[PDB]
Scaffold this active site. Structure first.
Site, PDB file in Angstrom:
ATOM      1  N   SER A   1      35.620  47.844  44.820  1.00 26.80           N
ATOM      2  CA  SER A   1      36.296  48.293  46.019  1.00 26.80           C
ATOM      3  C   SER A   1      35.608  49.519  46.587  1.00 26.80           C
ATOM      4  CB  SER A   1      37.768  48.579  45.703  1.00 26.80           C
ATOM      5  OG  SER A   1      38.439  49.193  46.784  1.00 26.80           O
TER       6      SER A   1
ATOM      7  N   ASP B   1      45.728  32.294  35.591  1.00 25.99           N
ATOM      8  CA  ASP B   1      45.277  33.629  35.199  1.00 25.99           C
ATOM      9  C   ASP B   1      43.774  33.781  35.445  1.00 25.99           C
ATOM     10  OD1 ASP B   1      44.880  36.057  34.060  1.00 25.99           O
ATOM     11  OD2 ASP B   1      45.146  35.387  31.971  1.00 25.99           O
TER      12      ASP B   1
END
Length: 330
Positions: free
Chosen positions: A199, A35
């Site tokens: 992004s 994770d």
């Protein structure tokens, strides 16, 4: 040193991925959920409340000649999906794909929430976010990656998750045969303890690319792609009959649909998520309403590039002094 381990989806939907991990001496192999959005290595154990264990493999520290109680240390964690676990702590030898760390903090669960109990395939979590998020008290502990780093050939790990197929986690090297083209690197903020990056935009299907900054985290422990409501609405508007359902808990779409792809930007590069990756199947067994793999982050407080996004790429988690993230097509 290096390590290389195969990671395998737990079910037909790629809800999560498990990777075998050797703990203790002799080795006890547990299948852990790696994770990158948390920083605790915790396991089902001989200390876990019996009624909360249902099929998991447990770690038994009393059977490990290298286990030592970390006296006075406790841990307690709550995840984004509302699940939780807590317990005490041992140090022991932990190996992943041939890479060994001695003295790793292995957090033994005394209690786990129902979602963990109900998932017989996940024997615990191995956190790969920054150690500043580790929950052990009163002495915070380091992640497996942080402990291994100095010994690694290169201070990196890579995630290469499969779509309905096994993939690979590598430590200490970049497998140049595992991706196509070049790797585009992008800046990371560690301010919140995550692999947080920005992004450069998105496209829906064959549509034009929208240049827009989307801050979010690269999180292998989250199944879906969670993005701002504007972006998610633009995506689902291209699917006939798709709608957001408060009763179901997100966007659903007709199971008869063909989903468009979704592209996200990494610098000037583009990663394309095929439409099929966005299908999470019937909302309930036999239903003709299907659950979407792109969902709104509104009210989470952060955008999450979870498995839906990451499995479309070869992803480099660069833990050099200034960390960065790399993405390549594959």
């Amino acid at each position: 040193s290096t390590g290389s381990a195969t990671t395998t989806p737990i079910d037909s939907l790629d809800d999560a991925y498990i990777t075998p991990v050797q703990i203790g001496t002799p080795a006890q192999t547990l299948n852990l959920d790696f994770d990158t959005g948390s920083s605790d290595l915790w396991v089902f154990s001989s200390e876990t409340t019996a009624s909360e264990v249902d099929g998991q493999t447990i770690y038994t520290p009393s059977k490990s000649t290298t286990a030592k109680l970390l006296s006075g240390a406790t841990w307690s964690i709550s995840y984004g999906d509302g699940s939780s676990s807590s317990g005490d702590v041992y140090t022991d030898t932990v190996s992943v794909g041939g890479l060994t760390v001695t003295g790793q903090a292995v957090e033994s669960a005394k209690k786990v929430s129902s979602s963990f109990t109900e998932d017989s395939t996940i024997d615990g979590l191995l956190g790969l976010a920054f150690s500043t998020l580790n929950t052990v008290s009163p002495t915070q502990q380091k992640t497996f990656f942080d402990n291994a780093k100095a010994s690694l050939d290169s201070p990196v790990f890579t995630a290469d998750l499969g779509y309905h197929a096994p993939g690979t986690y590598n430590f200490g090297f970049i497998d140049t045969t595992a991706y196509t083209g070049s790797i585009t690197y992008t800046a990371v903020s560690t301010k919140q303890g995550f692999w947080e990056w920005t992004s450069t935009g998105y496209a829906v299907g064959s549509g034009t690319f929208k240049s827009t900054s989307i801050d979010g985290i690269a999180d292998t422990g989250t199944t879906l792609l969670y993005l701002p409501a504007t972006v998610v609405s633009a995506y689902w508007a291209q699917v006939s009959g798709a709608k957001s359902s408060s009763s179901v808990g997100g966007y659903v779409f007709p199971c008869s649909a063909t989903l468009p792809s979704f592209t996200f930007g990494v610098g000037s590069a583009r990663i394309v998520i095929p439409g099929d990756y966005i299908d999470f199947g019937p909302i309930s067994t036999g239903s003709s309403s299907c659950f979407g793999g792109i969902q709104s982050s509104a009210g989470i407080g952060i955008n999450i590039f979870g498995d839906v996004a990451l499995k479309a790429a070869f992803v480099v988690f660069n833990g050099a002094t200034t960390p960065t993230l790399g993405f390549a097509s594959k």
